[model samples]
Target: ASPFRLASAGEISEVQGILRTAGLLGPEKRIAYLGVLDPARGAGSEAEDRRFRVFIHDVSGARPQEVTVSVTNGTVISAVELDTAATGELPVLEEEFEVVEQLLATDERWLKALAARNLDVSKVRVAPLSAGVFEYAEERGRRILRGLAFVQDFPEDSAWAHPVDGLVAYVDVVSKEVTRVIDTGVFPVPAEHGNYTDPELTGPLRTTQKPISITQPEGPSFTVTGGNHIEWEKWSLDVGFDVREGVVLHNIAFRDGDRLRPIINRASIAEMVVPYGDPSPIRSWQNYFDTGEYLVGQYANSLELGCDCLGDITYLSPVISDAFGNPREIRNGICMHEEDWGILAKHSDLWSGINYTRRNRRMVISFFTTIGNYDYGFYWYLYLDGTIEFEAKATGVVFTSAFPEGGSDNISQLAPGLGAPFHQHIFSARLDMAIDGFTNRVEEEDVVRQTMGPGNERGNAFSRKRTVLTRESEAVREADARTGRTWIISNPESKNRLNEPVGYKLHAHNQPTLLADPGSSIARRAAFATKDLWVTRYADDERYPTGDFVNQHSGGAGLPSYIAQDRDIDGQDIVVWHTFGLTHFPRVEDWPIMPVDTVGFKLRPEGFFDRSPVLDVPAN
Candidate 1:
């Protein structure tokens, strides 16, 4: 048996053919290939073969029913009706934007609203907004879609400049009627800056004189096994894909001499949230759960050779389900490459006139996803010194709201008229550690100011205090810049030569906690963002921090729900959840295309090995 083989184009077509024969696929109905469901366990001699799971939408039926069909070995196994309410399949594709625009044009109420504001409906630009839990009582139980209407002064220019503030419209997906109208309040449209394409408006003022290049004299020093498995020096891991969390690493290990010791069993971005600060009804309700609502893999962008990655990169394609539940291959969904990381360590001796320095190298596995206006690039890096880093790079257009120039101090003036609001992008990574073995414990270490005592009579000294978290309930902690708070996950039975427990220290730079009030709706929905770290006993089914099914969902499913049980976590199979992100206050330079804002955390080896693992590499 192969290791999670990708469903080929022919395999997908075969599954569709099987469905067709089973009378599931027809002109009146639309079928979508969701994804290939791998066997429950590994493909060993005792394991079973993989199967495909397809989601079907019967558009012509009286009431839409959520259906799932299972196909195994090119045969239809069963078509079952899942007992769940369906939100119409993922939003209309990019190509269907014209249809949305056409629908909005003929809407009498929509046209009337634009006419009342003395705006031209023809020049209005419609943006499909993620329909959060509908606030209107009339839309309590309807299959409706929503969109934001922006007024564009220049037909050839960007619509971001002139936004029609304080209005959002809901439309029925099937009937295409404007159902409910929401008017928070009205604000004057801003003046139009020239189109973003004009060189005068878009070009940079300061530029580098020369292009920086990283070249490997011989070539990359890494080998890829079985396409998805990567082996570079002392680091090894298998790269896998998840429908919600684009890139997933499995069975990560570090080589100590000849022995491959376990580090992390699995790791991936569990969930993400971008909560806006404005209190306006239209903007206040804007708390986006990017991964749970719209899967990251669904929006994964294909990578190009020299552009997205460099240095002899290896690409892995992912099979994803389309809107119609048809399997389609996303080419180059993941990229792996080796990069030069300046200097790992350096030493100098003036007496002997001898200096030794080793250039650091890192193997990076990365993938990118674009959720509406924001694009996130996630990277997993393995360094020569036994360090693993989870990094997120946010680079995309800012979600702009209409504001009068010099009117509100809460917003930044990106242009004369465009105001970029303040927002937070909170991301959490779920790490299931198998340091040496499965059973592990987490200890919180905090640096505290010392009181006047025998050791510190002056009362000016600080001391480090370590606390072993005994259970799951005591493990939720926050990063304190003042106290230098950190957490260490360790294997109690594994010890180094110095008798210290083998572990990895979780450290973060600029980690932020949720600023929203605890009682706020956004805070209620995204309770995971309230803290920076959470430790829970490992459960096979609990993958997402926010409970599954985030689309238009009210609060009560994610991390909060998972931790309610508060099962014992000490000295048990445990998983760690880390949240880190940027509190972005947009600037003038951020408009058009925002420069990448990065946030990440590091897992450094703490007594995991007796000595430096990369000391054997020849110094350059």
Candidate 2:
């Protein structure tokens, strides 16, 4: 039950000071103290003798290292490292044990306060779990379990004792104080114990399906600028050309909006291959390779559903794709983006032209919690006539709300608000393809776009639009496998208003109303009139309704104001994302590396296209 026995205020302060002296607060840092962690009792037993975990980070590093400090005797007792390198090895460090004495001498006032509380120590239990990941349980405490220990021996001399990277320390039973930290290692520590074998308890992977048709005038040919051409309707194979000494090129085109957007939306191939430039000197394949599979398709019934409301009907395939471009008939995962609901519900056509779901149209192949300093993107190869094509894009960066100084509520303060949604930047894609015994290079046009929403008065939902710019293309180098001439697609947009400062509140009184008969059912008539009202805003006011407006503008369908409140990043805020695209080569080792067999993509139906391009594709 309790990990440690009660300690005097002097003893607790000593422990807290020692840990702090042990480099808990380093250069350019401010620390925040989380409440005490009592082993014997889940909550603090002695109100004055409370054990505490403090969080701190350096402001300069965009990828700031998070460090945790334990306060007992007004001193830090233990400092442990958490994150491992891409090489899967722990970091190294020079331990400072001098803090032991300093910890014993710190103030005891805080500890004295904790000692007065009468809390039960036997009821507390620290569940053993891995770092960075969590396990949910309903049996014992119905608690969501996770491991949070730090591994101090990683090779980088970097400390891993930070909550951001998953290093969590619990009260040590033997020390009667906090000494150790949890990590993501395969093996468990002798002191910590927990095991939950039900794989079903984990969240399921997301999936979707849709049927798509395209119509075009003259020659129905669209070209992808650069990358590899990989197809699996047959056996898995790579189709592309060599750009230079080490770069590979693949290019192909579809009739504009043909199969491109759908594929772009459903599958992301970049997650399969390993990155060429890893920070650690280690050179193993596992250090950088990600092998995962995903699939997507067009839905038939949803075609009319999409076109009638949003734009053109794009049938989404329920099947996922493997690393080799093969579709998996069954799904065992959850979709990452909520917009997938539109595609799944067959309501994408209603907002097709809109950017929220359009730019991110691709159905994510698998689910993984994204964080800072991690690599993620997509790779695709298209074949049109005699040329191969390549396309690439990146995702995953949870944005931080631009908070005013001296703010409490760290969680709420870190939330994304209007104009600052995570992953707002668009990645550029370059295409290179070889066809009919010849090679050609094409660069995707990089466009700058602003995603606007109704102001805070209307819940400030996001509404995206694009602005095109002209720029020259050049061949770039690939360090991963040195196989092709890469074309870079970068967004020229300098400022995304999303990340800027803006005043916002959970509740706004500016709900627009349709003056329907007061006696009749207001909800029913408004349902009919709301459509005209929205159309009027879009056409006359140039204001498009978004998730934010949906919640704030109309009392969020009768939901409370707090529910309508957007966290700064994903909440009811208007924001902008810089889109970047690229083209690169594909290698063989990227296969079956993670046991996943195929990879593909899908497109969400934004209200962009008014109807299915029925004439684009030849009738079967």
Candidate 3:
């Protein structure tokens, strides 16, 4: 059996049955998260067997609970109740999406608010936004989703282009009532249409690009065993999926000589926050926790050949739990393929008139999900030269607003009166490191200039400075672009042939963390995004960066709480949390539909091997 495989449909049913028998799964109480629970996380726990972890959200009581179930033996392990107000609210459900719309359609005030704007109910799309914790009156102590309105002429029209600004509807989803409708201003809708997909709107497509094809007729260079275990070239790993985290890679290792070396134990993006910068009236609380609140993985788009992917692609269709406690598979949820990269190593010798060059290639595993006005693509790449990369692409229609009359300085103009908000797409990825085994440590490396005091001072000298982080309190770090900073995870026991500790260096991209104020609600809720690197001892329960619940949370949880004990991390099984993403400001070309903007980091082996591992491959 594949121990690290994603939860199967049968497994989900078995888990649901166990939860239902315990009175944990019902109409009002449903599963919010389900995944393969490894036994290696808990102390003194059995490391040989695997179980399923299910998170149930009690909508009636506004309670969230965690339960562990054994699908093999059909038994429940344990259960615990979590503090909803402190940890935040549970993820929004697919069932609730319709409930919000249906709840608003009948509200007397909702109809009047639209009539005042003279917009047809069919022409307006009601969006259920996750209400972040603030001092608002009706929103407190309630399971709520704030409602926003957007105008669309037809089903195919981009509703984001016409926003009803300065209007907010606080809806109590449980009671199914619109609590209040607050209209701060009456901004007119934009007169322009934002449909760019149809040929009639953008018919004369550019034809200068030539056709490109990628194929592997003899089959792919990789093989999948036990359905989830994959081996390609020198890389071996097990793939998993989550409702909160889309694609997860487990037990990632590299084959060196006759042994499979352990690199990362588990890797997945834990949380993401997209906060708007337009702090105009009724817009300050517009930040969204897409992963925690909306469950982006549940919104994953099924892949299509030659459209989303090409080449000899192998797809993994994992089963995920819907909001109504049923099993549904996202068809072709994950795509794996081989890509021919540029040259790996190229050199020429003038003395012998000889040149040597080796082609570079990579195995790509990726998935895509659309949340609201934006579509995001998450990709993981494993290269032949012992390099791992994670890239997140931001593309889709920009979240638009009405350019307020006489004063619209803080937004970007797409049309004459249509404007898109400036925002940041901040993502936090959790990497459980096992460089050689579980005994590893992290060291911060920076290239610093040497002070010219004693060496006949030409004043041109630079070198690297390394500092090992020994505890969790001091491990929270920011990326220093001026010093060319990076963090290295090295094994304490394993050394390379050069007598240096084996390690993999993490290179961060030039990206800003949370741009909100230090006391902002988003800053406190998404505290993980305040730093670039966070190191702590491994704990299985420490998964999400924004704590267990993020829909409607107060602050001081997640990464901040993980290090509250302030434990030592040297020679310990460590988990590294990285914050990297884009602070987007829209341009004129970004209207209607925006192209992809990419941001990510790289992991390359440093002093881990004596020679180039790709040198032995035979040339074509």
Clashes of each: 7, 186, 0
Quote each prediction's TM-score: 0.89, 0.22, 0.96
Ranking by lDDT: 3, 1, 2
Query: 1 or 2: which has the higher lDDT?
Result: 1
> By TM-score, who's the top model here?
3
Candidate 2: segments with Cα more than 4 A from true spot:
1-268, 271-405, 408-432, 435-438, 442-620
lDDT (Cα atoms) of all candidates against the true structure: 0.75, 0.22, 0.85
As for lDDT, the candidate ahead, 2 or 3, is: 3
Tens-place lDDT per residue, model 3, 1-620, is 66677778887777788778877787878787777676565347444456788778777765678788777777888888877655566677666666666777778787888888888887878788888887776665577888788898888788888888777787877777787788876888887777897788798899999988888979889899888888998999998888888898998999998989999988898899998899875567788888888878888999999899988899999898766557899999889998999888888999989898888899999999988778999999999999999999999888888876675657878888887778999999899999988999999999988887788288787889999999998999999999999999999899999889999999999698999998988889889999999998987778888887788887877999998868889989899999999998788799778989999998999877778889887664
| Model 3 worst lDDT run, 10 consecutive residues | 39-48
Q: Which candidate tops lDDT?
A: 3
Model 3, total clashes: 0
